[PDB]
Design a protein around this nucleic acid. Structure first.
Ligand SMILES: Nc1ncnc2c1ncn2[C@@H]1O[C@H](COP(=O)(O)OP(=O)(O)OP(=O)(O)O)[C@@H](O)[C@H]1O
Ligand SMILES: Nc1ncnc2c1ncn2[C@@H]1O[C@H](COP(=O)(O)OP(=O)(O)OP(=O)(O)O)[C@@H](O)[C@H]1O
Ligand SMILES: Nc1ncnc2c1ncn2[C@@H]1O[C@H](COP(=O)(O)OP(=O)(O)OP(=O)(O)O)[C@@H](O)[C@H]1O
Ligand SMILES: [Mg+2]
Ligand SMILES: [Mg+2]
Lengths: 229, 337, 290, 305, 130, 250
DNA sequence: AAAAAAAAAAAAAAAAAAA
DNA sequence: TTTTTTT
């Protein structure tokens, strides 16, 4: 809320997330965060909205956003011994807000770095505008705006395999340890549902095939295979 | 008379009400002339009451409270006169009390910003206002009496004196005399003060019965008012018999102060100089613990105290007895009996 | 006459609202209150002005809205269940059916099972919420004793327990619902505040969040993380049902009948069963006992 | 007392080497000396006397008004409110004498201004497109009090004045006034003060052949002469700076860390030697002036103990 | 994330102090004109140098070399001192070296100068250990 | 007049913690006040039964009748009549003291001052609740109010005793409420060992003999009396009977 | 037909700082 | 991490 001095009604100002509303958002350097903003957002992500009432004014705002953030391991480099909770200082509840995790490591291999340097240099020269992707950007946008117009539904076998996979996940990660391992909730099941819907949407199919459920479960599994490695 | 003990405080107040003369030199500018005294002590030891008594006794005085004042609103204000439509300076609180005395309560409970203004008026006794197209210097030669609480609930006698006070030394060194009051718990003193207080609460206004409360009264009969030496009606001042030593009533004391502040301007002599310099050299190199460090400005305080005591006995010259009494009072106020 | 802005949830992000003037004729007086979101059906009319043509140099005209119908839309954004100016009003046959279905056996069972039919389990919460949003009967003994007649409710536990969905349904349910969250509410925001009128040029009172909750419910999310200075200010609102302000020369006492429903998380993000409640939360006796 | 402080005041009133060098490189004749000492040493009174005896002196102290710096005196002054201003400027900073009391009292804005007035650098702060900078060329003389109100047995640079080390190194001469409780000095001080009090004038105890108007004439006379630099002092000052860097080879011994290594030390040495050559003598610079400047620096340094 | 960094450390020596004092005294006791500005502008906007295929081999060899210089046979798990920022920096510096002298394509001398410049500051970037 | 309702830190008074860090008010502010009441909560189930009875009765279904009887039997008066009475008494009367009351007040003040000193020299920290001359003025004003209540133009011993009783209640509840806050404890365990060995269960001994023995030893009188009275305060092995002469080991 | 506004006092929210 | 104080 912003006011000119002795100015009534404390007219609100839109925040970055509020501008990102009704569209895809991007966040960089996510580890550094405002504590008040942090406790606002982690309740905001589930509610997909934020409401702040101050100085005798109140309102409800819309924050329908998709969040994409990048962080950094504490201590410079990711320590392979520990896990995400040990390596990152970021609080426990927010980790369950995110649906997927990706960790990337750099190495001192002589075969990889030469290839990387060749790729980087080979862009300032030769094929400066002749990199080869299978599809052009316009084709990608055409396919995106054609696929976004599909809403998949679920079938009986999908539901059965879904509940079975959920039970397997919940029993598997609860067998590790108590009061130190807590990562599987119902939000994980909803995330897996959403991921299956998205995958089926990619192939432009109005139904769900259990193979999509298998792929989504594999993604969530490797997100927990990675926490151990 | 209703305050028990604190005799040296009463003497200090008496000397302050009729302080020394101002000094101005064609080359030496100006020298401050009056005395300032600060009180710090444990709660409920009759400091505010004595300050109220000083308010009532003195000729011109203004009452201020640390929390109820603003520094900018204390010295001057820029307000527009209604008839002329022009903005003119409005006199502040302590400017109204020029040549008088200003009493401050809850001094340490004041906002620090205002404090700097005090330092200015304690530096050269002049406040300057430069704002909204007005550049003017205002004279303010008043004296300040104030009382403040220690940082804790009660004074800690085992700690550094600077540790017990929230005010910076920059303005604390300005004050000539600093007093520390503590209510030592002794049953004999407890009984004595209990007798005194119980004697006080059994008082009845003359010509009035005890069954009904105090009522409001009418003004004097005349809107305007206005054999000698043989009656001594109020001259002796002893209104009632309670002790062999004499006492004087307030109006006679005020008349004495009025006469003294005008009819005598004493001058010091070399014997008091010798005594004062000897005492200053001794005190500077006594080299033991003391409440506050000493510096060159204490000699000014000795000079002005000797001048005030000469004014008290109505003599045009300062004799060594005043030097002795000033030295004794300073030793009491800084060393302790 | 009253000033009507744009809904902050409707304006495009990072833009500025457009004001209009609404004139309320007889029988519509005082129906609208400051700070609330409303929807008005009216007539659009135009009129001549002098200074408007002066400051622009073109024959511009002013426009005002003559109100003809007003419908409140605060909190209850679910606007598809039924039509009409007031959805909390009943016809006579609806009252008859109320009486008819208020007498069958096990009606309390049906009512408790009919709240949030999309959340599984949590029967105790589904009962406590109903008991909280019905409330008791305020008691006045001889005009010299006052007994509060509303029930507070506090929830607590591990994440993923659908507390926020229950709070949202409560907001959708009650006649007067106010939603707050975490750091997003200040102590002077919930309570009424002192403001200087920018036109009349003196102090005046501004309605706090709890005032809108009078005869209603106030819902707080993330109760534990709210700063304690923002938390201690609602003791009187919970217990005495009164708000008193002595600020800037104004000494007034308001009235607030509000039921507070709060949710939080224990220390460490999980509830340790083998410890008493004193070592699980940071609250103390004065706030817990209420 | 305080003879050497008055000697430094003399050397401040004449000014150092000035009027540039080859290739247009900037050099100033202004000298920056900071007075340091306990309260009740009458450094403020000496500063007032200097302000009285100088024509360009301006006196400032801790707070009391907001128009002292960063704003011209004509801000919103005309009845028509024409916004008359110059932008970044100080009070008569062109060839003025900035006398400051309570150098540890002012806020960050005045501190930024006094860092900007450094080494004859102009003031170019802009607010509304104004860029008419004031040619700041002034000598800085300021008095500050310790944050403890007294000298300390532990190390002085950590005690310091709560001032930046860069600003401290900018100053040409740092001098101390430490109250030493003793008999043979307090006796004389008390005797002089009481004799002043008795006569109500400046007593005949003083023995001064020269008078304030006479000083005001002779200072302008000496500044007018303006002797030029003599080359042969080059080797002597180079070896003096070599031994000063030898001192810097011992400044990690601590117990006082003002024996730092800075070219500004040599520059101030040259400026003070030029001022000593300027106050008297012919159009040359004497080696005795360099020796006197070094002795003055030594006296300034030895006050630490 | 700065491109380069430089450190100045003044330490007391007899010699260097002697030369500094002599230089300062002599100054106190071959340079072009705005020609510089117009030359800079002409290089900035007329000249668009590009790198050649030959310089790629030298660049990758230098990268591999400092990668090796950043590691040893022991299991100390040395920090990866050869970052991609280094490659970007050297590419930009080699382009800058061709920007002057009004050339149109870089030569080896450009890349050797760039790598020596980029490694000189690193050589004095170490802490008290090693 | 100032009336204030305040809560201590940590909610409940938490007697186990010292009074000094249970009250955040400074010494200056408390001195201005002169009646401070520590309202502790207690559980004995008989006061609880009575309070539950009173609350369920004061429920509006019942009390609306019963309170009416208090205006029919003349036991209690209406609020507005009390308002008129207090304003009339404030305007009309203003009592005065008597010399005997002055002497009694002086002696009582000396006694409480001595008790405060004896507590302070033991606890060796400053008392969190002070006693100063303002409290003497407080007792005087309480007596004045008591006399003013009955319109008597003078105050006598009848009001003085009640005033001193109220002041002693309001000072013993707060100031002298366990001034120790819970040689150290080594002599305590040595003391408890010997009496257990020497004195069996069922018999009794004189106080003078025990004091003599443990003053002859290293325990001395100051340590033994406090230890004896705390063993009494334990109230599980030793009982007092027949004035302070008999020490009965139950 | 128009005096209308710089100077104060008091009430907040945000950010940064110290424990 | 929390409360305090300043803008
Ligand atoms: N020596 C004394 N003679 C008479 N009354 C005394 C004496 N000492 C204390 N009192 C009484 O103690 C009370 C304290 O009142 P007062 O507030 O003026 O004291 P104080 O020491 O200035 O306190 P504070 O610092 O809280 O303002 C008064 O009622 C005063 O009569
Ligand atoms: N029976 C159920 N129990 C729990 N959650 C359920 C249930 N049925 C559905 N859910 C889903 O579980 C999720 C739980 O809600 P959400 O993740 O927003 O947080 P919460 O549990 O209310 O609280 P918190 O924000 O404190 O973690 C919702 O998305 C809800 O739709
Ligand atoms: N050497 C001295 N000769 C004469 N008087 C002196 C001397 N030293 C101090 N004084 C006296 O001390 C007073 C001036 O000291 P003062 O405290 O004002 O100066 P300061 O050291 O700048 O400190 P402050 O900031 O406290 O003013 C005068 O009363 C002056 O007579
Ligand atoms: Mg008092
Ligand atoms: Mg000074």
């Amino acid at each position: 809320v912003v006011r000119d001095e002795e100015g009534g009604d404390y007219t609100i100002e839109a925040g970055a997330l509020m501008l990102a509303d009704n569209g895809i958002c991007c966040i960089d350097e996510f580890d550094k965060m405002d504590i008040s903003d942090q406790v606002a957002i982690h309740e905001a992500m589930e509610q997909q909205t934020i409401s702040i009432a101050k100085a005798g004014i109140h309102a409800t705002l819309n924050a329908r956003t998709s969040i994409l953030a990048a962080a950094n391991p504490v201590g410079g480099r990711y320590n392979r011994k520990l896990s995400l909770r040990g390596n990152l200082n970021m609080t426990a509840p927010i980790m369950s807000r995110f649906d997927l995790f990706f960790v990337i490591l750099d190495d001192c291999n002589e075969k990889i770095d030469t290839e990387l340097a060749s790729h980087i240099v080979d862009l300032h020269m030769k094929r400066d505008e002749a990199i080869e992707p299978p599809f052009s950007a316009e084709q990608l946008r055409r396919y995106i705006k054609y696929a976004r117009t599909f809403k998949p539904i679920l079938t009986k076998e999908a539901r059965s395999y879904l509940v079975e996979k959920y039970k397997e996940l919940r029993k598997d990660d609860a067998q590790g340890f108590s009061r130190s391992s807590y990562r599987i909730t119902v939000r994980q099941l909803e995330s897996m549902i959403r991921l299956s819907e998205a995958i089926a949407r990619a192939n432009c199919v109005d139904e769900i095939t259990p193979s999509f459920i298998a792929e989504a479960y594999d993604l969530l599994r490797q997100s927990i295979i990675r926490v151990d490695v | 008379p209703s305050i028990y003990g604190h005799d040296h405080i009463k003497k200090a107040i008496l000397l302050m009400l009729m302080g020394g003369v101002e000094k101005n030199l064609e080359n030496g500018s100006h020298l401050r002339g009056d005395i300032n005294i600060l009180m710090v002590g444990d709660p409920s030891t009759a400091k505010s009451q004595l300050l109220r008594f000083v308010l009532n006794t003195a000729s011109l005085a203004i009452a201020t409270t640390g929390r109820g004042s603003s520094g900018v609103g204390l010295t001057a204000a820029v307000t527009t006169d209604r008839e002329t439509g022009e903005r003119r300076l409005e006199a502040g609180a302590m400017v109204l009390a020029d040549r008088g005395v200003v009493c401050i309560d809850e001094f340490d409970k004041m906002t620090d910003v205002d404090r700097v203004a005090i330092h200015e008026v304690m530096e050269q006794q002049t406040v300057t206002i430069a704002k909204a197209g007005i550049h003017t210097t205002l004279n303010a030669r008043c004296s300040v009496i104030a009382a403040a609480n220690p940082v804790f609930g009660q004074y800690d006698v085992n700690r550094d004196p600077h540790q017990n006070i929230a005010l910076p030394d920059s303005l604390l060194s300005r004050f000539d005399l600093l007093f520390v009051v503590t209510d030592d718990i002794n049953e004999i003193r407890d009984r004595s003060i209990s007798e005194h207080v119980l004697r006080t609460h059994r008082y009845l206004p003359p010509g009035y019965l005890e069954g009904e409360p105090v009522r409001e009264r009418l003004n004097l009969s005349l809107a305007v008012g206005e054999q000698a030496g043989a009656k001594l009606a109020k001259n002796k001042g002893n209104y009632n018999g309670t002790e062999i030593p004499k006492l004087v009533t307030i109006p006679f004391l005020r008349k004495y102060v009025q006469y003294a502040k005008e009819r005598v301007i004493p001058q010091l002599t070399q014997e008091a100089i010798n005594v004062i310099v000897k005492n200053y050299t001794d005190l500077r190199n006594d080299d033991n613990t003391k409440k506050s460090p000493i510096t060159a400005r204490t000699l000014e305080t000795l000079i002005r105290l000797a001048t005030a005591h000469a004014k008290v006995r109505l003599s045009k010259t300062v004799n060594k007895v005043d030097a002795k009494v000033a030295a004794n009072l300073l030793r009491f106020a800084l060393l302790g009996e | 006459r009253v000033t009507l802005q744009e809904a902050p949830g409707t304006v495009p992000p990072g833009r500025l609202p457009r004001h209009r003037e609404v004139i309320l004729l007889a029988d519509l007086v005082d129906v609208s209150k400051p700070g609330e979101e409303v929807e008005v059906t009216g007539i659009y009319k135009n009129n001549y002005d002098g200074n408007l043509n002066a400051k622009n140099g073109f024959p511009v005209f002013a426009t005002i809205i003559e109100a003809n119908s007003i419908k409140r839309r605060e909190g209850n954004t679910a606007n598809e269940g039924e039509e009409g100016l007031d959805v909390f009003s009943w016809t006579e046959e609806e009252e008859r059916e109320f009486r008819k279905i208020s007498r069958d056996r096990g009606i309390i069972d049906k009512i408790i099972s009919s709240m949030a039919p999309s959340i599984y389990g949590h029967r105790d919460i589904k009962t406590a919420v109903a008991c909280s949003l019905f409330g008791g009967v305020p008691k006045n003994v001889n005009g010299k004793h006052s007994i509060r007649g509303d029930i507070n409710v506090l929830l607590l536990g591990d994440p993923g327990t659908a507390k926020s969905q229950i709070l949202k349904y409560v907001e959708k349910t009650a006649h007067r619902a106010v939603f707050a969250t975490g750091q997003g509410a200040s102590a002077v925001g919930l309570t009424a505040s002192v403001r200087k009128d920018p036109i009349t040029k003196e102090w005046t009172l501004e309605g706090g969040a709890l005032v809108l909750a009078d005869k209603g419910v106030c819902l707080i999310d993330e109760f534990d993380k709210m700063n304690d200075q923002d938390r201690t200010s609602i003791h009187e609102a919970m217990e005495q049902q009164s708000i008193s302000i002595s600020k800037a020369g104004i000494v007034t006492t308001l009235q607030a009948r509000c039921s507070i429903i709060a949710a939080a998380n224990p220390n460490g993000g999980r509830y340790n069963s083998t410890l008493p409640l004193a070592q699980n939360v940071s609250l103390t006796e004065p706030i817990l006992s209420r | 007392g305080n003879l050497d402080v008055k000697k430094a005041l003399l050397l401040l009133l004449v000014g150092g080497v000035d009027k540039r060098v080859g290739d247009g490189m900037k050099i100033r004749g202004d000298i920056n000396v900071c007075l340091m000492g306990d309260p009740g040493v009458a450094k403020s009174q000496l500063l007032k006397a200097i302000c009285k005896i100088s024509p360009r002196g301006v006196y400032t102290t801790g707070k009391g008004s907001s128009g002292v710096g960063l704003t011209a005196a004509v801000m919103k002054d005309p009845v028509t409110d024409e916004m008359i201003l110059e932008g970044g400027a100080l009070v008569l900073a062109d060839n003025g004498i900035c006398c400051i009391d309570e150098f540890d009292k002012m806020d960050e804005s005045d501190r930024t201004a006094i860092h900007e007035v450094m080494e004859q650098q102009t003031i170019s702060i802009s607010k509304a497109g104004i860029n008419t900078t004031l040619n700041a060329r002034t000598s800085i003389l300021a008095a500050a009090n310790p944050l403890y109100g007294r000298y300390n047995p532990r190390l002085s640079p950590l005690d310091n004045i709560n001032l930046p080390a860069a600003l401290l190194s900018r100053f040409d001469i740092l001098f101390l006034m430490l109250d030493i409780p003793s008999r043979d000095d307090d006796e004389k001080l008390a005797e002089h003060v009481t004799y002043v009090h008795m006569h109500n004038k400046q007593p005949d105890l003083d023995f001064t052949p020269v008078e304030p108007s006479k000083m005001r004439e002779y200072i302008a006379y000496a500044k007018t002469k303006r002797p030029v630099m003599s080359e042969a002092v080059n080797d002597y000052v180079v070896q003096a700076y070599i031994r000063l860097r030898q001192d810097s080879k011992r400044e990690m011994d601590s117990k006082f860390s003002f024996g730092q290594a800075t070219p500004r030390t040599l520059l101030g040495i040259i400026r003070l030697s030029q001022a000593l050559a300027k106050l008297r003598l012919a159009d040359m610079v004497d080696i005795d002036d360099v020796e006197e400047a070094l002795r003055l620096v030594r006296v300034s340094k030895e006050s630490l103990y | 994330r700065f491109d380069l960094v430089y450190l100045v450390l003044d330490k007391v020596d007899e010699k260097n102090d002697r030369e500094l004092a002599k230089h300062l005294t002599n100054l106190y006791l071959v340079l072009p004109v705005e020609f510089l500005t117009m030359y800079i502008s002409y290089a900035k906007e007329h000249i668009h140098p590009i790198i050649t295929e030959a310089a790629k081999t030298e660049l990758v060899r230098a990268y591999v070399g400092m990668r090796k210089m950043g590691d040893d046979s022991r299991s100390d798990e040395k920090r990866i001192t050869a970052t991609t920022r280094q490659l970007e920096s050297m590419i930009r510096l080699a382009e800058a070296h061709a920007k002057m002298k009004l050339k149109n394509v870089v030569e080896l001398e450009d890349v050797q100068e760039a790598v020596r410049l980029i490694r000189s500051a690193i050589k004095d970037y170490a802490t008290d250990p090693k | 007049s100032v009336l204030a309702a305040a809560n201590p830190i940590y909610g409940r008074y938490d007697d186990l913690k010292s009074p000094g860090d249970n009250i955040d008010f400074q010494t200056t502010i408390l001195s201005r006040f002169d009646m401070i009441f520590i309202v502790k909560d207690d559980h004995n189930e008989e006061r609880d039964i009575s309070i539950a009875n009173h609350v369920i009765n004061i429920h509006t279904g019942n009390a609306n009748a019963m309170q009416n009887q208090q205006e029919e039997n003349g036991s209690e008066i209406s609020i507005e009549k009390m308002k008129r009475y207090i304003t009339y008494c404030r305007l009309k009367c203003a009592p005065r003291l008597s010399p005997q009351a002055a002497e009694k007040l002086s002696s009582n003040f000396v006694t409480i001052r001595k008790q405060l000193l004896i507590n302070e020299l033991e606890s060796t920290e400053r008392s969190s609740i002070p006693i100063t001359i303002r409290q003497l003025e407080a007792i005087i004003r309480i007596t004045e109010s008591l006399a003013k209540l009955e319109l008597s133009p003078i105050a006598q011993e009848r009001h003085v005793d009640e005033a001193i009783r109220l002041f002693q209640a309001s000072t013993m509840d707060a100031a002298s409420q366990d001034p120790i806050g819970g040689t150290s404890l080594s002599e305590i365990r040595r003391f408890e060992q010997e009496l257990k060995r020497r004195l069996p269960i069922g018999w009794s001994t004189s106080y003078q003999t025990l004091r003599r023995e443990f003053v002859d030893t290293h325990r001395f009188s100051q340590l033994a009396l406090d230890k004896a009275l705390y063993a009494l305060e334990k109230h599980e092995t030793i009982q007092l009977r027949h004035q302070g002469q008999n020490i009965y080991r139950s």
